[PDB]
Amino acid sequence: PGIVELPTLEDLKVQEVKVSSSVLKAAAHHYGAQCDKPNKEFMLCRWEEKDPRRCLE
Amino acid sequence: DGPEKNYEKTMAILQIEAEKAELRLKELEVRRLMRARGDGPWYQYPTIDKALIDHSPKTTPDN
Numbered sequence: 629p630g631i632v633e634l635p636t637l638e639d640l641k642v643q644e645v646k647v648s649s650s651v652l653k654a655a656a657h658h659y660g661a662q663c664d665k666p667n668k669e670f671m672l673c674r675w676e677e678k679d680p681r682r683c684l685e
Numbered sequence: 686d687g688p689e690k691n692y693e694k695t696m697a698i699l700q701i702e703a704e705k706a707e708l709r710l711k712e713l714e715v716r717r718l719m720r721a722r723g724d725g726p727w728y729q730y731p732t733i734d735k736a737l738i739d740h741s742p743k744t745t746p747d748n
Contacts, residue, residue, distance in 0.1 A: 671746075674746035675742050675746050678746065678747065678748070679747075680746075680747070
């Protein structure tokens, strides 16, 4: 009953970090505090917009 | 006593019975009517209150 709109694969070709899990967790404390501003903006969209497709940017 | 007492009193008896008779017929019709449609005070079968909903943010964004 309608379009299940999915974004094209073009916008999904984003630079993904290539580091093992321990690398993330080792610097986790020094990562969350100093990169909070985009983290909180993205996650606020996740809970507010409630739709994955809205927070692609 | 005079026939007037019986005459007027019987008219009151008729008036009471006529009003009661038409109300019972209205009772059957209304009860049938609002049982089906349901936009009436009685026959409102129980539902679940919206108060018992947790509106706080969950552990997953998609909710």
